[PDB]
C-alpha cells in the first residue's frame, strides 16, 4: 500500500520522484499558492486559468491543491482530469463535461471531514487547453457559468492567447513565472542534497542558467550528471563543463571560431564552416541563443550593429520556431550578420 508507493517513487525518475505533493513544496510560484492556501480554509475557490512557460509547476500545483483539498480518498472521486491525450471536441464537452458538472458532489466519509476541509464542490481540470478548439471552448462557457455551485473549472495552458477571450475572462488568470537560478536554487540544492549529488560551487546555478526558466529540465540534467558521476566512481565533484557538455551547449572555443568566421571571411568559407559545424550535432536554437548572448553582452560593437543583430536573431528564432531546416536557417543567419 504505502510502502509500495514509496518504493515506486524511489525507483522513478527524479522529475516524478520529487514532484511537489503539497502546496508548500513549490518554491518560486508563491503568489498563486498563497491564494490557493488562503482559499483552502474558505470555500470560494473560483475558476482558475494557469498559464506560463513549460516546467513551472502548473500541473503539480493543481494536483497538490486538489490533494490538500480532498484527501487521498476523495481525490479519485471528486476530480475530472481531461488532458490532451483524450478527445475534447464539441461532442465530448457537451456530453461528458456537462454531465459531470451537472452531477452532485460525492458524499465524504467520516474520516474525510476530520482531516480535510472537503469543500462542497468538485474540480474539472483541463490540462493542455491550447489544443482545445475554439468552438469546444465556447461550449464550456455556460457549462462553467451555471454549474459553478457544484463544480469548479481549472484550465491549464502554456500560451494564454490560444484560449478565447470569454473563457479567459471567466477564469482568474494565474501566471507562473520562469524558474531562474535565484528563485529555484533552493529547490535544486534540496534535490542535490537528498540524492547526495557531489557538485562544485557554481554548478547548480549554472544548470538553471541552461534551463532558461525550467525546473524539470534542470532536474533532468542534474540526474544525468549524477548518473555520469556515479558510473565513473572517481569520487570527485561534477563540474560546469561536464554539465554543459551533455546539455547541448556549444563550447566557447567553437563559438569564438564562429565569431571569427563571421567577422573576417566571405560567403565561401562561412558556408564551408557551417557545413562542417552541422556535422557535429548541435541544436540551432542553442547556437542562436549563445550568439545572441555573446553579441549583446559584448562591449565591442556599435549600437547600430546591435539593433540589427538583435532583429536578425529574432527573425532567425521566429523562423526556427516553426520546424524549419536548422542548417539553412543557421547559414542564412550567419551570412546576414556577416554582411555588416
Amino acid at each position: 500500500s504505502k510502502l509500495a508507493a514509496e518504493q515506486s517513487l524511489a525507483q522513478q525518475p527524479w522529475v516524478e520522484k520529487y514532484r511537489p505533493k503539497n502546496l508548500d513544496e513549490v518554491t518560486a510560484q508563491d503568489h498563486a499558492v498563497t491564494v490557493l492556501k488562503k482559499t483552502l480554509k474558505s470555500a470560494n475557490l473560483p475558476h482558475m486559468l494557469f498559464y506560463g512557460p513549460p516546467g513551472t509547476g502548473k500541473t503539480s500545483t493543481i494536483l497538490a491543491l486538489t490533494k490538500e483539498l480532498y484527501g487521498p480518498d476523495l481525490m479519485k472521486s471528486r476530480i475530472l482530469e481531461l488532458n490532451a491525450s483524450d478527445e475534447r471536441g464539441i461532442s465530448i464537452v457537451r456530453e461528458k463535461v456537462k454531465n459531470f458538472a451537472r452531477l452532485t458532489v460525492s458524499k465524504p466519509s467520516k474520516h474525510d471531514l476530520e482531516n480535510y476541509p472537503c469543500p462542497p464542490y468538485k474540480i474539472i481540470i483541463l490540462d493542455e487547453a491550447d489544443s482545445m478548439t475554439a468552438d469546444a471552448q465556447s461550449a464550456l462557457r455556460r457549462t462553467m457559468e451555471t454549474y459553478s455551485g457544484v463544480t469548479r473549472f481549472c484550465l491549464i495552458c502554456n500560451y494564454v492567447t490560444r484560449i478565447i477571450d470569454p473563457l479567459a475572462s471567466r477564469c482568474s488568470k494565474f501566471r507562473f513565472k520562469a524558474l531562474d537560478a535565484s528563485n529555484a536554487i533552493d529547490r535544486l540544492r534540496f534535490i542535490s542534497e537528498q540524492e547526495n549529488v557531489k557538485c562544485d560551487d557554481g554548478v547548480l546555478e549554472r544548470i538553471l542558467d541552461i534551463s532558461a526558466g525550467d525546473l524539470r529540465r534542470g532536474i533532468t540534467l542534474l540526474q544525468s550528471a549524477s548518473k555520469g558521476a556515479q558510473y565513473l566512481g572517481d569520487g570527485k565533484n561534477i563540474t560546469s563543463t561536464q554539465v554543459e557538455e551533455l546539455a547541448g551547449v556549444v563550447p566557447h572555443d567553437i563559438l569564438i571560431e564562429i565569431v571569427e568566421k563571421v567577422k573576417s571571411g566571405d560567403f565561401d568559407e562561412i558556408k564551408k564552416y557551417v557545413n562542417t559545424f552541422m556535422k557535429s550535432g548541435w541544436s540551432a536554437a542553442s547556437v542562436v541563443n549563445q550568439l545572441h548572448e555573446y553579441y549583446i553582452t559584448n562591449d565591442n560593437f556599435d549600437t547600430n550593429f546591435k539593433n540589427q543583430i538583435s532583429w536578425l536573431l529574432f527573425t532567425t528564432d521566429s523562423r526556427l520556431n516553426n520546424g524549419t531546416n536548422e542548417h539553412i536557417q543557421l547559414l542564412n543567419l550567419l551570412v546576414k550578420i556577416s554582411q555588416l
Binding site: 525507483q11 502554456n158 550535432g281 520546424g323 536548422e326 536557417q329 554582411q339
Partner: protein, 343 residues
C-alpha cells in the same frame, strides 16, 4: 552490406567513445531511467545506438522482433492499418506513415500499452521507440505531453529524430536530450577498411576510402552503401580513380541547378516545374529537394556574394513557407522563380 556489419551492443560501437560511455552511464541503473530523445544528423547511427542501449537494459532478445498489424477507427467510417515492430521487451512506433491521424494512434496505442502490464516466460517497464518524431504534428505531441508524465513507471519513450526544430518545448523538457554527432572522416574510413577487409575488396590505394567519407558528409549509411555500390561497378576491386556513384535525385538536382544558372526565363521555369513534379512524384521530400538545390546553387562559382546571399535568404523564406504549407510544389516553384529573378 550495411546490415551484415552492424553493432549489436554498446561494446561493439566504433566511434564516439564519449557517447558510448554516456550510454553505459545511462544504462548502468536501468530502472531509474527518464525518457530520452536522440537527435543529430541523419545517418549517424542513433537508431543502432538506441537498440544497443536496449540490449544493455534488457537481454539479447531485444533484436528478435516481429511485425504485427494494428487497426484503428477515426471519427468517421475510415479505417487505418499500420504495422508495429514489437519485441518481448519493447515496441517501435513510426507515426510518419500517415497524415493528421497520428494523434489518435498515439493516444490509443500508448494508453493501451500503459494500462497493459508485461508478461513472463521470456525489467518492469516496456520501452517505446518513436521513430522520426519530426513528422509528429503539434496535436499528437500535445497529446503525448501528458501521456509521458501520467504513466512513467511502465512506458519510457526513446524518440529518434534528426532535428529538434519541429519538436515542441514541453516534449523537449519532458525527456533527456542526447546529441549524436556525425563521425569524422577518420572513423568512417576505419569502418570502411574493416568492412572491405571482411568483404574481400581489392584496394590499390586507401585514400579512396577517405574520399568516400568526403562524399558522405559524415553519413555512415550513405558511405557504406556508396562503397558497396561502387564495389559492384568495379567488380569487387576498387581502382585508384573509381568514380563516385551519386544517387539519381542528386544528379537531377545538379542538372536543375545547371539549368537555373544557364537560362533564366519562364519557358525554363516550365521545365523546372516539370522536373520538380517528376522529383516529387517519386517519393522525394520537398525539404530535402530545397536544401540540396540551394546548396548546389551556392556552389556555383559563376555567382557572387550578392547573389548567394539573396539565394540563401529566399531559401530560408520558402523553407518557412513549405513548413507552413502542404502543397510543396507551390513553394518550390516560387523559390525557383525568386532565384531566377535574383540572378
Amino acid at each position: 552490406w550495411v546490415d551484415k556489419y552492424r553493432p549489436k551492443s554498446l561494446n561493439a560501437l566504433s566511434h564516439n567513445e564519449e557517447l558510448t560511455n554516456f550510454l553505459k552511464s545511462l544504462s548502468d541503473q536501468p530502472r531509474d531511467l527518464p525518457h530520452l530523445l536522440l537527435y543529430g544528423p541523419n545517418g549517424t547511427g542513433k537508431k543502432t545506438r538506441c537498440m544497443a542501449l536496449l540490449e544493455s537494459i534488457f537481454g539479447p532478445g531485444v533484436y528478435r522482433l516481429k511485425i504485427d498489424v494494428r487497426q484503428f477507427v477515426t471519427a468517421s467510417n475510415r479505417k487505418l492499418e499500420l504495422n508495429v515492430v514489437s519485441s518481448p521487451y519493447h515496441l517501435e512506433i513510426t507515426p510518419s506513415d500517415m497524415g493528421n491521424n497520428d494523434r489518435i494512434v498515439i493516444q490509443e496505442l500508448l494508453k493501451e500499452v500503459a494500462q497493459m502490464e508485461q508478461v513472463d516466460f521470456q525489467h518492469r517497464y516496456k520501452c517505446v521507440i518513436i521513430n522520426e518524431a519530426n513528422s509528429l504534428t503539434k496535436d499528437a505531441q500535445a497529446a503525448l505531453r501528458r501521456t509521458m508524465e501520467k504513466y512513467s513507471k511502465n512506458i519510457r519513450l526513446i524518440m529518434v529524430c534528426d532535428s529538434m526544430s519541429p519538436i515542441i518545448a514541453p516534449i523537449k523538457s519532458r525527456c533527456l536530450l542526447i546529441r549524436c554527432p556525425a563521425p569524422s572522416d577518420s572513423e568512417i574510413s576505419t569502418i570502411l577498411s574493416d568492412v572491405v577487409t571482411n568483404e574481400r575488396i581489392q584496394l590499390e590505394t586507401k585514400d579512396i576510402l577517405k574520399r568516400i567519407a568526403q562524399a558522405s558528409n559524415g553519413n555512415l549509411r550513405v558511405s557504406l552503401l556508396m562503397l558497396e555500390s561502387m564495389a559492384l561497378n568495379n567488380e569487387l576491386a576498387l581502382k585508384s580513380s573509381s568514380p563516385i556513384i551519386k544517387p539519381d535525385w542528386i544528379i537531377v538536382i545538379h542538372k536543375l541547378t545547371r539549368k537555373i544558372v544557364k537560362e533564366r526565363s519562364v519557358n525554363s521555369l516550365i521545365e523546372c516545374r516539370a522536373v520538380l513534379y517528376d522529383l516529387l512524384a517519386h517519393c522525394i521530400p520537398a525539404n530535402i529537394i530545397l536544401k540540396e538545390l540551394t546548396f548546389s546553387l551556392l556552389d556555383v562559382e559563376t555567382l557572387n556574394t550578392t547573389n548567394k546571399s539573396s539565394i540563401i535568404e529566399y531559401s530560408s523564406v520558402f523553407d518557412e513557407r513549405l513548413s507552413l504549407g502542404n502543397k510543396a510544389i507551390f513553394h518550390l516553384e516560387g523559390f525557383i522563380a525568386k532565384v531566377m529573378c535574383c540572378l
